[PDB]
Design a protein around this motif. Structure first.
Motif, mmCIF file in Angstrom:
data_model
loop_
_atom_site.group_PDB
_atom_site.id
_atom_site.type_symbol
_atom_site.label_atom_id
_atom_site.label_comp_id
_atom_site.label_asym_id
_atom_site.label_seq_id
_atom_site.Cartn_x
_atom_site.Cartn_y
_atom_site.Cartn_z
ATOM 1 N N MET A 69 -3.811 1.372 3.092
ATOM 2 C CA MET A 69 -3.649 0.587 4.307
ATOM 3 C C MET A 69 -4.977 0.453 5.052
ATOM 4 O O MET A 69 -5.355 -0.654 5.448
ATOM 5 N N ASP A 70 -5.673 1.569 5.262
ATOM 6 C CA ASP A 70 -6.974 1.504 5.931
ATOM 7 C C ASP A 70 -7.916 0.545 5.215
ATOM 8 O O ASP A 70 -8.633 -0.223 5.862
ATOM 9 N N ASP A 71 -7.910 0.574 3.884
ATOM 10 C CA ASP A 71 -8.807 -0.313 3.143
ATOM 11 C C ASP A 71 -8.409 -1.780 3.339
ATOM 12 O O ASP A 71 -9.274 -2.635 3.566
ATOM 13 N N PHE A 72 -7.110 -2.075 3.283
ATOM 14 C CA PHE A 72 -6.681 -3.446 3.522
ATOM 15 C C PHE A 72 -7.080 -3.896 4.928
ATOM 16 O O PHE A 72 -7.597 -5.008 5.116
ATOM 17 N N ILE A 73 -6.844 -3.033 5.914
ATOM 18 C CA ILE A 73 -7.172 -3.362 7.296
ATOM 19 C C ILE A 73 -8.682 -3.609 7.446
ATOM 20 O O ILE A 73 -9.100 -4.556 8.120
ATOM 21 N N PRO A 105 0.818 -1.217 0.000
ATOM 22 C CA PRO A 105 0.000 0.000 0.000
ATOM 23 C C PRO A 105 0.853 1.268 0.000
ATOM 24 O O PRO A 105 1.845 1.364 0.732
ATOM 25 N N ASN A 106 0.449 2.234 -0.818
ATOM 26 C CA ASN A 106 1.218 3.452 -1.018
ATOM 27 C C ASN A 106 0.709 4.598 -0.162
ATOM 28 O O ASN A 106 1.240 5.712 -0.228
ATOM 29 N N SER A 107 -0.328 4.332 0.628
ATOM 30 C CA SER A 107 -1.019 5.405 1.329
ATOM 31 C C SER A 107 -1.806 4.931 2.535
ATOM 32 O O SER A 107 -2.188 3.764 2.628
#
Ligand SMILES: Cc1cc2nc3c(=O)[nH]c(=O)nc-3n(C[C@H](O)[C@H](O)[C@H](O)COP(=O)(O)OP(=O)(O)OC[C@H]3O[C@@H](n4cnc5c(N)ncnc54)[C@H](O)[C@@H]3O)c2cc1C
Ligand SMILES: Cc1cc2nc3c(=O)[nH]c(=O)nc-3n(C[C@H](O)[C@H](O)[C@H](O)COP(=O)(O)OP(=O)(O)OC[C@H]3O[C@@H](n4cnc5c(N)ncnc54)[C@H](O)[C@@H]3O)c2cc1C
Lengths: 509, 509
Positions: free
Chosen positions: B433-437, B427-429
């Motif tokens: 990251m929030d979306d993956f989490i 993740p570049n942002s």
């Protein structure tokens, strides 16, 4: 030069270091054999029997006692800042006014009477009955009267005693000691409070005129003329000489007369036997040793699980006369409720939770023992003979204590807890009772009297706690007590140090 | 009449049934919705993810969670003697002393502090470090510290963490929780031990004063005045009314407030919406729901076959601060080594043996959710909204947890196991990251807090676990916790029940 050196930073010594250093013009040195407290468990009130036998316990062994079935006894003393107060069952009992009347008779000085000690105790105590005109208010030592935390077993014990005629007291300290009550405790916010905690605060230890030297054992006092000139102090990595104008001994009932004897001050024959030159023949040093005993114990199997107690395990002492539960006055015997199945080593331990012990004793033993050094060195073991149960009076009183315990033990009020009596059973004779008592008694941990204060020529100190043969040497701890108080002696020890502290501020420069 | 009825025979309920029936004078009834355990696989530790979704699992479905990519979640609870302990990953973590400090702040009562809970935990535990003065000895719940059975993957994980500065602990329970160690487990002789196994022994179940009623669901409490008078119990072949003097609720974080609400006790507006008459308006019932999340997961393809593990598959949790591997204190995040390629349903499952997951989470979420009944009936589904990842703090902390996981994951110490990272990739942002989490997080299975203990007027129970509006009703299970402990909450739940058991034996008749 330090104006005052205090030897031993236990109960009396901690009070003294704090109180004497209040005068900013007097330089105070406190010398303590132990280290600063690091063990967390000693501030857990229910862990108190679990810390003796450890690093900071002196752990003495008495001579075999003919009066106690030939048994030798372990005496535990604290070796750390706080002394025996870091080890103690934290019970607070001033004693009975009659206890102190005998001190007035022995000393010839009314300052040791209840009336004069009253403000003294008051200055010491931070008590919830403060304002009384009896109990202290705002003093450094918190006194806690348990109510809700008192175990149901102890409540049933209290009911048992009340129903036989014992009056309900709020603690033992009003001047009335016979009756039924939870023991008052030196506790604050759930945590135990030692003499060191109470007097040696951050602020006190920060004073410029107070030096505390730990890990340091005083081996000898050096004499010049009628004065102590210096102290030989033995530390971790060598010995050294400390000079002082005034010396106060607070090393406790065993170590104070020991230091005196090592210094050439004591019974000439004893010093010779120990290979120490006699400089001052004082026959009473080390004599008149007293201690309380507790029968361990009048053991009862429990009808249901006994919890490990929310307090200190010996929650309630009932002091009384030996012949009646209704009579008032100065106590003669005591029965205490033990929320642990406490038994001497003469008896197998019952599984925890399965049993409880009523502990029974006499409050004013007439037996008198002695302590003497066995050699000149620090590590030469003291010869301690408390002469337990040597007098017919002590043995007879003990029979009444046992009877009183069994009477309380078998009350309907305790029928919810009592499955049956395990010990002693039912002895058919004085001989069999005496034998059970001899096998069961253990120290209550109140040794005192070995440097007795008195007005007679051979007393060790006078009414002012000054060692009679010298001019700048005082003994201010349990060793000076002419006689045991009815109960635990911590409060009396503290009172001894406080009246000395007052006497000092009163006359010097 | 039964003196005490316990509702729900899960972790807290099993402990209570055993401990309360120790008093032979008190008659105890335990009512449990589930049957007696018959499934053999639940005593096989490695079969633990394989028994949820079966007959004895309640299997709830939360509302769609906006904070977790709109995903709804499955919450599994046990329905059998033993409750959630028959389903659990059998990890034993007391929590951190700071976790319990917040309970003291919330309750106003020091009994909920680490110092007071210490003997409580000790009474519970049979721990190989017993004698510590920290860990328990001889208690009914075996604590096992794995050593030889720890999988080589988990050892490499531990080495990875140690090399970044995390200290090596022996279990998480000394009072120090940050560091690196195999999780301690409730295991004995290779077999898992439930709360039911530990407390509800043959001997206990044989007591005359204890009745266990299984297959029986409590639908309503019946009120008279300020007291619960009776319970309506629904069984296989009809309903019936049980009378009791004292009622203790142990139905768990969801079912306790549910029973309260069905009984007319809860938020007036919620009860109206569910068609239940409001008898006692208690706005906090069902509120302050908390749960731990785990990102499933930081997935790594393995260089060689991953074995199905000699233990419980999640063998090692590393608790730590969010900003440093060297800093000590109360945990803020956790990374756990999963010897199974655990992924949420948002990701395709890798072939078994081909991969492993580092699971990552935050230890003290600030998000707060709620539970409410949807109708008066037993089978009306609960509306559960844990509000996962609703606060900026929780999302931000989660980013640090993920970063910490990836840092541990890419260590040389794991190079023997790691072929390459499969998830998340890079993740570049913060957004990515929030979306993956959000797609990856799953419940850690620690719901609690819904009947919160507190000293404020609208808390559900007081420091004594008594429901504030009534006189003979207690809630004693995960629902009372003011806040999550850093890790798994079983030990804390057990501690809650044990302090209640002590409090009960302490005051009654
Ligand atoms: C286990 C136990 C439980 C007790 N429980 C209670 C109770 O519940 N209630 C109660 O009222 N009383 C209790 N007591 C008794 C009470 O604690 C003591 O009587 C009291 O502390 C005595 O104080 P002290 O100043 O005379 O001696 P201590 O408090 O013993 O102090 C003596 C100090 O001197 C130091 N010292 C000794 N020799 C030297 C040396 N040569 N050089 C330097 N320093 C030295 C020691 O290390 C120690 O710190 C208990 C005693 C024990 C052992
Ligand atoms: C899959 C899983 C794994 C877990 N792993 C761990 C772990 O590894 N470590 C850890 O510390 N914690 C773990 N936990 C959490 C832990 O198991 C629970 O937090 C703990 O068991 C809670 O105990 P309790 O008494 O509050 O509720 P429960 O143990 O759930 O007991 C509630 C009981 O009440 C009964 N009941 C409910 N309603 C009624 C009713 N109306 N009438 C009669 N009976 C009723 C239920 O059937 C159940 O038996 C795990 C939980 C789950 C689901």
């Amino acid at each position: 030069n330090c104006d005052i050196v205090i030897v031993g930073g236990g109960s009396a010594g901690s009070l003294l270091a704090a109180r004497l250093s209040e005068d900013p013009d007097s330089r105070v040195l406190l010398i303590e054999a132990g280290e600063e407290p690091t063990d967390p468990d000693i501030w857990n009130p229910a862990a108190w029997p679990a810390l003796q036998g450890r690093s900071y316990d002196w752990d003495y062994r008495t001579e075999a006692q003919a009066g106690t079935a030939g048994r030798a006894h372990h005496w535990a003393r604290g070796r750390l800042i706080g002394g025996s107060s870091c080890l103690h069952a934290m019970g607070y009992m001033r004693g009975h006014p009659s206890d102190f009347q005998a001190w007035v008779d022995a000393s010839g000085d009314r300052r040791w009477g209840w009336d004069e000690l009253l403000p003294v105790f008051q200055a010491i105590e931070d008590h919830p009955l403060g304002g009384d005109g009896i109990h202290g208010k705002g003093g450094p030592l918190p006194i806690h009267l348990p109510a809700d935390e008192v175990s149901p077993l102890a409540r049933a014990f209290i009911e048992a005693g009340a129903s036989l005629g014992l009056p309900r007291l709020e603690g033992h300290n009003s001047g009335e000691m016979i009756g039924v009550t939870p023991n008052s405790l030196n506790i604050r916010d759930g945590r135990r409070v030692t003499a060191a905690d109470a007097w040696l605060t951050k602020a006190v230890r920060g004073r410029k005129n107070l030096t505390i030297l730990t890990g340091s054992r005083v081996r000898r006092l050096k004499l010049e003329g009628n004065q102590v000139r210096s102290l030989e102090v033995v530390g971790r990595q060598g010995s050294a000489e400390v000079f002082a104008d005034q010396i106060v001994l607070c090393a406790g009932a065993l170590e104070s007369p020991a230091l005196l004897m090592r210094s050439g001050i004591g019974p000439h024959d004893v010093l010779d036997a120990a290979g120490v030159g006699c400089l001052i023949d004082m026959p009473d040093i080390g004599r008149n040793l007293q201690d309380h005993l507790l029968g361990a114990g009048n053991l009862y199997a429990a009808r249901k699980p006994v919890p490990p107690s929310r307090l200190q395990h010996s929650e309630s002492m009932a002091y009384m006369r030996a012949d009646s539960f209704t009579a008032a006055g100065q106590p003669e015997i005591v029965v205490g409720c033990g929320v642990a199945p406490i038994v001497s080593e003469s008896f197998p331990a019952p599984a925890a939770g399965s049993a409880y012990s009523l502990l029974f004793g006499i409050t004013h033993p007439t037996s008198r023992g002695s302590v003497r050094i066995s050699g000149p060195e620090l590590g030469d073991r003291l010869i301690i003979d408390p002469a337990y149960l040597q007098t017919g009076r002590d043995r007879e009183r003990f029979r009444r204590a046992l009877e009183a315990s069994r009477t309380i033990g078998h009350r309907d009020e305790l029928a919810g807890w009592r499955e049956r009596e395990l010990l002693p059973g039912t002895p058919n004779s004085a001989a069999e009772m005496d034998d059970f008592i001899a096998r069961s008694v253990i120290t209550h941990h109140h040794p005192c009297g070995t440097c007795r204060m008195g007005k007679d020529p051979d007393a060790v100190v006078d009414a002012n706690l000054r060692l009679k043969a010298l001019d700048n040497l005082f003994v201010v701890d349990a060793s000076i007590m002419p006689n045991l108080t009815a109960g635990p002696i911590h409060a009396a020890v503290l009172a001894i140090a406080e009246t000395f502290a007052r006497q000092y501020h009163h006359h010097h420069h």
